[PDB]
């Protein structure tokens, strides 16, 4: 009865989306000129870790980055000189995500311990200390992002995401409805909305100020492992074990384009956009990362010399370089 | 060349590198084990004998063990399973007593079948393709009482064997040993009465055999 109501809505709404669907990115972008053959070359190789690298993040300065690996250590790298600024020994070795505060004063990490740890980089004692132990989740931490110096959003295996107040240590908001391990999230540039992908083969856009999902995106055949916003914060792209990448338009509530190739059969671990958004980068379980033209949906150039699954990938804020982390305990800077 | 500030920064980075290498070398000595039970399996009993991941470490015969169990992780095991890929071995606890016990959810799911299927899924995983498995069949006293007065046919319909009991225990042991497609990977099984005190010895022997097998693989004697 109420289930039938939900179905009829799901039906009418679909008949309405198809209405706002006359053209396709391709048809509209069939006259733009191809980007070319992007040929990036490793410029730096960070080889300090001793185990699989599971996450990495760039600082807003576009020079320092933080990477987390299963050896229970966080490393702050100076990409320009390949120097190690800090080495943070993690209480729990099972870390699967890390984040860099936009101000650069804090770094957050989390993993299979179900808690998110916040580390203070600027201290009078000149050492990295754990400032807060955000422990409200039930499942493993999946992703973390800093809204500001005192707010952070996390995703876990509870099929839920939470917004935290670091000083208080309490979840100020909770986002439920993913019915599947939330596996990643991204923050819009306006910093008032964010999206998350889950194993339920759907991604939902959330309003941080309110706390409720506004738009739910579907049409993805398998789990979702990576999500990233378009530079203008008006669309986003998602990876998956389906071996396909896709981007959706917030104001269209629809899929815009699909990035899949017959030769490619494997999952996608991470996605990222170039500064202008013309280039979409995605790490693959095939040990390599491909580069896709944003509008033409063509693999501009394959780009990887990693020895195992490319776990994490990130483009600098200045767009100057792209860093790829893999399960071979190696980080490579491509330019 | 570089300025004094960069010289100092490079010296700090080199010190960090040396410390990191020393920590890694020190940590590489211990052996890591993954504990994978099933509900009411005797994994809790094994741990007692000695909210997220629970780590229990101990030293036996100048050897350091790190035993991890994911019990509070109610999420899908498909994810985060790859984390324990470079692990020395697995520990699997099946309750012999489960032979006659539909799962608590009463989905007509034979407790043992759920375990047989769970064991099959764990053994034939992409990761953990070469990780020897230590199998524990505890609650022999229970199995011992139930095996008499109730047939194993209920669990294994194609019993075709004597009802009691060591033979029944061999049927179930072999049924678990099956569905191991990969060669060069052995499953060590033990019968636990729930009050024995040599399970540490058995796990130590299994780990030493695994280490010996690994060392004979480097020599190329796969």
């Amino acid at each position, epitope marked *: 009865q109420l289930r039938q109501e939900a179905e009829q809505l799901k039906n009418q709404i679909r008949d309405a989306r198809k209405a706002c669907a006359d053209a396709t990115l391709s048809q509209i972008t069939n006259n733009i000129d191809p980007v070319g053959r992007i040929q990036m070359r490793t410029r730096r190789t960070l080889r300090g870790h001793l185990a699989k690298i599971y996450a990495m993040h760039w600082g807003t300065d576009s020079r320092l980055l933080v990477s987390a690996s299963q050896d229970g250590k966080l490393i702050i790298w100076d990409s320009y000189t390949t*120097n190690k600024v800090h080495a943070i020994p993690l209480r729990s070795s099972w870390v699967m995500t890390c984040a860099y505060a936009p101000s650069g004063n804090y770094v957050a990490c989390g993993g299979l311990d179900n808690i998110c740890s916040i580390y203070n980089l600027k201290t*009078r004692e000149g*050492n990295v200390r754990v400032s807060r132990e955000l422990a409200g989740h039930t499942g493993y931490l999946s992703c973390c992002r800093f809204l500001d110096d005192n707010q952070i959003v996390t995703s876990s295996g509870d099929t839920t995401c939470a917004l935290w107040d670091i000083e208080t240590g309490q979840q100020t908001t909770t986002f439920t409805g993913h019915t599947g391990d939330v596996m990643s999230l991204s923050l819009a540039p306006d910093t008032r909305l964010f999206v998350s992908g889950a194993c339920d083969a759907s991604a939902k856009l959330w309003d941080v100020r309110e706390g409720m999902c506004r738009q739910t995106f579907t049409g993805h055949e398998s789990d979702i492992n990576a999500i990233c916003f378009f530079p203008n914060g008006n669309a986003f792209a998602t990876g998956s074990d389906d071996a396909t990448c896709r981007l959706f338009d917030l104001r269209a509530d629809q899929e815009l384009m699909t990035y899949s190739h017959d030769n490619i059969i494997c999952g996608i671990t991470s996605v990222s956009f170039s500064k202008s958004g013309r280039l979409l980068l995605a790490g693959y379980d095939d040990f390599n990362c491909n580069v896709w033209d944003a509008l033409k949906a063509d693999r501009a150039g394959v780009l990887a010399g990693h020895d195992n699954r490319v776990s994490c990938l990130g483009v600098t804020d200045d767009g100057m370089a792209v860093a790829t982390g893999s399960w071979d305990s190696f980080l490579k800077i491509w330019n | 060349t570089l*300025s*004094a500030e960069e010289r100092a*920064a490079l*010296e*700090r980075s080199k010190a960090i590198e040396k410390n990191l290498k020393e920590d890694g070398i020190s940590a590489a000595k211990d052996v890591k084990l993954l504990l994978l039970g099933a509900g009411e399996s005797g994994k809790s009993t094994i741990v007692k004998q000695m909210t997220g991941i629970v780590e229990t470490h101990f030293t036996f015969k100048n050897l350091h063990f790190r035993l991890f169990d994911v019990g509070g992780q109610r999420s899908e095991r498909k994810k985060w399973i790859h984390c324990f890929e470079d692990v020395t071995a697995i520990i699997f606890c099946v309750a012999l007593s489960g032979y006659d016990q539909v799962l608590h959810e009463d989905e007509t799911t034979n407790r043992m079948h759920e375990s047989l299927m769970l064991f099959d899924s764990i053994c034939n995983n992409k990761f953990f393709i070469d990780t020897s498995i230590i199998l524990f069949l505890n609650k022999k006293d229970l199995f011992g009482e139930k095996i008499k007065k109730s047939p194993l046919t209920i669990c294994f319909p194609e019993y075709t064997g004597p009802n009691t009991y060591e033979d029944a225990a061999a049927y179930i042991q072999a049924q678990f040993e099956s569905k191991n497609r990969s060669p060069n990977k052995e499953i060590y099984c033990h019968m636990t009465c729930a009050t024995d005190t040599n399970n540490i010895q058995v796990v130590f022997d299994a780990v030493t055999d695994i280490i010996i097998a690994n060392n004979l693989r480097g020599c190329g004697l796969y």
Partner: single-chain antibody, 233 residues
Framework: DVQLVESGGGLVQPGGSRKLSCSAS????????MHWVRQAPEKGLEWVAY????????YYADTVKGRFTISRDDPKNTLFLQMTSLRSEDTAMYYC??????????????WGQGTTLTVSSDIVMTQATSSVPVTPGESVSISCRSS???????????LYWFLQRPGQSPQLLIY???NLASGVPDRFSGSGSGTAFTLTISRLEAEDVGVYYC?????????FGAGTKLELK
């Protein structure tokens, strides 16, 4: 919290030997490089010695070489300076300064209270002025000059500014002639070319009266300019 105390000074006849030490507490002493800075009884600041964080790098001044040795014992969080064949001009005031070197660091951020001692080429920073007549509520600028350009190929000009209020230890104000030390009023502002540097003080008050020193960290030995003093006409 963080503080450095040193006490090894006293009346020493010329040609003798003495040992100086400052105990470090409230911070990770083992992770900081330590410096010794000497100030003559009348005026002036001059670098003395430096020992790296891992005690793998050591430097000395010309006169310090061959007579002074710098040692540290991280377990006991203590810094040591050994004096031999002390000269009559060696009588001065000694400070031990912490300093940590990594990307975006603030070396020379904390200074000790110091210990007095009595007895009986290189870059030339040039703080031309020696006294500046000023009144509260009006701006003031102090300029520092260097012999060679401090702008490294990195893009960082290693120029530092310190304030030493009367009767108290000097404190870091600006590092790299563009950054502001933590817990420093925003009115301070450092800027300049690769060879000339200046400061801007807005709405000056009686609390800023003192002497300012500009130091270069481009290469050893570290050099200080004479100071520029402020008054209250």
């Amino acid at each position: 919290d963080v503080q450095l105390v040193e006490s090894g000074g006293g009346l020493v006849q010329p040609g003798g030997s003495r040992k100086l030490s400052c105990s470090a507490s409230g911070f990770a002493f083992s992770s900081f490089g330590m410096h010794w800075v000497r100030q003559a009884p009348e005026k002036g600041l001059e670098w003395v010695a430096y020992i790296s964080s891992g005690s793998g790098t050591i430097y000395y001044a010309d006169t310090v070489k061959g007579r002074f040795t710098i040692s540290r014992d991280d377990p006991k969080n203590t810094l040591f300076l050994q004096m031999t064949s002390l000269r009559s001009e060696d009588t001065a005031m000694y400070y031990c300064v912490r300093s940590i070197y990594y990307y975006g660091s603030s070396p020379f951020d904390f200074w000790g209270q110091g210990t007095t001692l009595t007895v009986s080429s290189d870059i030339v920073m040039t703080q031309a002025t020696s006294s500046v007549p000023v009144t509260p509520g009006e701006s003031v600028s102090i300029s520092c000059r260097s012999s060679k350009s401090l702008l490294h190929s990195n893009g960082n000009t290693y120029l530092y500014w310190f304030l030493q209020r009367p009767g108290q230890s000097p404190q870091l104000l600006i590092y790299r002639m563009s950054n502001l030390a933590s817990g420093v009023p925003d009115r301070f502002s450092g800027s300049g070319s690769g060879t000339a540097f200046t400061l801007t003080i807005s709405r000056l008050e009686a609390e800023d009266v003192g002497v300012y020193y500009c130091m270069q960290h481009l290469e050893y030995p570290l050099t200080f300019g004479a100071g520029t003093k402020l008054e209250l006409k």
